[PDB]
């Protein structure tokens, strides 16, 4: 039978690998796989996961740096776990009578047992459906998969998806957040504060949480509530900078509300990521370029991250009815690629693009995008036109290392200042100028005159993000072929503490952080106050 032949082939492969390790010579895996499969008479080849899932323990520890699969999953310095909430209705269904004109799925739809703005056939959607929307099971399952691939899960970040999370009853939000923290740490708590304490003392660090919210649910109350949870990032859907579009699609709010929410969130200390949608109705091929030029040149709009979602028409929505009646037509594919190239050429060097298109399966789409690799096609077109993309994602060491083959040689220090949302922003970085390679970054902001938090009033400057890229280095370990634990963090904080005292004129510095970061900043010399890590500068 093929099964025992497969097993013997696998065992022989690990035997050769461990022998070669013992006498200490390098070995090529593909040739060994083919040769060993030839002997036992097979019609297939071994899979990497199978070879990983049969190593003895000590050898399992020693020889993972050769059998790892999908090296992109931890090429940015963290491990990402995505979880989903319970199905529910969007808050503006009541006082308007209906929801956005293009959103698919939801509690009242033909997509059975699916969350709003999702179909249920997606990877994460099918993971939570079989788990019946339980945060503990989802976290455990995803961490098990990540460990089975062969990655290190020392540092974790959560992403909470679904509809509007902050519109649910308080008890459910308590349940969800405390279960996430307990799943990481291993405790069995009763409320948020107990879970937060135990997670602070944990060994599997929780770097931060990300939540998606609407501009009318981002006020002082909601911001404070999210501050107690441990959240550090926000996702808001702007979709357009034009006031007529925001009311012809039954969005439910206005652009001025979006700007005010941006101002409050940035003064409180969060990070802002914006969803934008090209090819909206009543928006031609010339208003998109102006839209994005204003987006990146007007101080009221400048965000920290972007998500480009070209418009898709899906069955069971108002836009579907518009499309059937012969009143709405999509762009041609060449025009779409050209537009995306032009848009990507405008992104400033301090902005990071996380995703470039949706992930709806192709057969469910009636019109719109049909391919599945828009980003790389756009990059090739940009190379043809002679322009270049200079965002954050396509300039860091891991991406430059796996897509191209380059390494930093002549690292230098760079600083960029600007004005945004009524505040004076600075962006410090360590990067290689000649090859255009990014290593580590830090964001700093001087608090404006309209801050409401008690801890930040009276002359406080706040640090909003500190990050060093590369592959993941486990805590208290060192790897001379990677970039993390080599002192680029205490160099970036010493400079932030000099700007905040000699230029801002402040007398205190505050940091928003997770929990493992709490221990790190305690090591540096900061103390704890409220949900912040503060330090006197006098």
């Amino acid at each position: 039978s093929p099964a025992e032949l497969m097993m013997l082939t696998i065992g022989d492969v690990i035997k050769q690998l461990i022998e070669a390790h013992e006498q200490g010579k390098d070995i090529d895996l593909n040739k060994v796989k083919t040769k060993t499969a030839a002997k036992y008479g097979l019609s297939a080849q071994p899979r990497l996961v199978d070879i990983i899932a049969a190593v003895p323990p000590q050898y399992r520890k020693v020889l993972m740096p050769k059998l790892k699969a999908k090296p992109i999953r931890t090429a940015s310095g963290i491990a990402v776990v995505a979880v989903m909430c319970k199905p529910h209705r969007c808050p503006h269904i009541s006082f308007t009578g209906n929801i956005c004109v293009y959103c698919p799925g939801g509690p009242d739809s033909d997509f059975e047992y699916s969350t709003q703005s999702y179909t249920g056939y997606e990877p994460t959607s099918m993971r939570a459906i079989r788990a019946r929307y339980d945060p503990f099971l989802q976290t455990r399952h995803r961490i098990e998969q990540l460990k089975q691939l062969g990655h290190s899960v020392d540092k974790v970040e959560f992403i909470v998806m679904g509809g509007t999370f902050m519109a649910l009853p308080e008890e459910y939000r308590d349940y969800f957040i405390r279960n996430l923290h307990d799943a990481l740490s291993g405790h069995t708590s009763n409320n948020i504060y107990e879970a937060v304490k135990y997670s602070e003392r944990s060994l599997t660090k929780c770097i931060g949480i990300t939540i998606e919210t609407r501009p009318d649910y981002c006020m002082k109350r909601h911001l404070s509530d999210m501050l107690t949870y441990g959240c550090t990032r926000l996702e808001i859907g702007v979709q357009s900078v034009y006031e007529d579009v925001a009311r012809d699609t039954n969005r439910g709010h206005t652009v001025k509300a979006v700007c005010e929410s941006f101002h409050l969130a940035k003064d409180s200390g969060f990070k802002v990521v914006a969803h934008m949608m090209p090819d909206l109705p009543n928006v031609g091929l010339e208003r998109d370029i102006e839209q994005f030029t204003e987006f990146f040149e007007n101080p009221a709009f400048r965000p920290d991250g972007l998500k480009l979602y070209p418009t898709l028409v899906i069955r069971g929505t108002g836009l579907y009815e518009l499309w059937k009646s012969g009143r709405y037509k999509s762009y041609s594919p060449s025009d779409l690629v050209e537009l995306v190239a032009r848009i990507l050429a405008l992104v400033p060097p301090w902005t990071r693009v996380y995703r470039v298109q949706r992930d709806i399966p192709m057969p469910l789409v009636s019109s719109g995008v049909e391919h599945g690799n828009l980003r790389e096609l756009a990059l090739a077109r940009m190379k043809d036109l002679g322009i270049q993309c200079r965002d954050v994602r396509t300039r860091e060491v891991g991406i430059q290392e796996i897509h191209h083959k380059v390494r930093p040689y002549q690292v230098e220090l760079v600083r960029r200042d600007y004005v945004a949302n009524g505040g004076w922003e600075t962006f410090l970085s360590y990067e290689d100028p000649d090859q255009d390679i990014l290593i580590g970054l830090l964001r700093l902001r001087k608090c404006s005159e309209e801050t409401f938090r008690f801890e930040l009033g009276g002359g406080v400057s706040i640090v909003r993000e500190l990050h060093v890229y590369g592959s993941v280095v486990p805590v208290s370990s060192r790897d001379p072929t990677k970039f993390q634990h080599q002192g680029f963090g205490m160099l970036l904080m010493e400079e932030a503490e000099r700007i905040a005292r000699e230029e801002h004129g402040s007398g205190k510095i505050a940091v928003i952080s997770g929990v493992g970061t709490r221990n790190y900043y305690r090591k540096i010399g900061y103390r704890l106050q409220g949900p912040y890590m503060v330090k006197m500068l006098k």
Partner: protein
């Protein structure tokens, strides 16, 4: 060197030292603490010392037929302009078309 000179820049990107043209793709220049700073169409910034230099040496540097060595030439963005120079801290301030700053 040991002689005064008159430096001139036109709006068609031409650089003159005395009566002799020495470069043809310049967009900005400055002189601060016995140092000359230039920005080119090729998206490069250049810094020359003036304490020990001559017309021939400067022309040779800006000869458009010189292989670059990494002490004088540095790469920048597109459409950068020199705002000012801080020699006491060894810094150079630049402005970009969209409006931000850079040091």
């Amino acid at each position: 060197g040991e002689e005064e000179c008159v430096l001139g820049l036109t709006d068609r990107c031409r650089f003159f030292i005395n009566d002799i043209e020495v470069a043809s793709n310049i967009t900005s220049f400055a002189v601060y603490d016995e140092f000359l700073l230039l920005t080119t169409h090729s998206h490069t910034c250049q810094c020359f010392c003036l304490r020990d230099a001559s017309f021939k040496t400067l022309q040779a540097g800006l000869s458009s037929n010189h292989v670059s060595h990494g002490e004088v030439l540095r790469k920048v963005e597109r459409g950068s302009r020199i705002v000012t120079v801080v020699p006491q801290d060894t810094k150079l301030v630049l402005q970009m078309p969209r409006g931000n700053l850079e040091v």
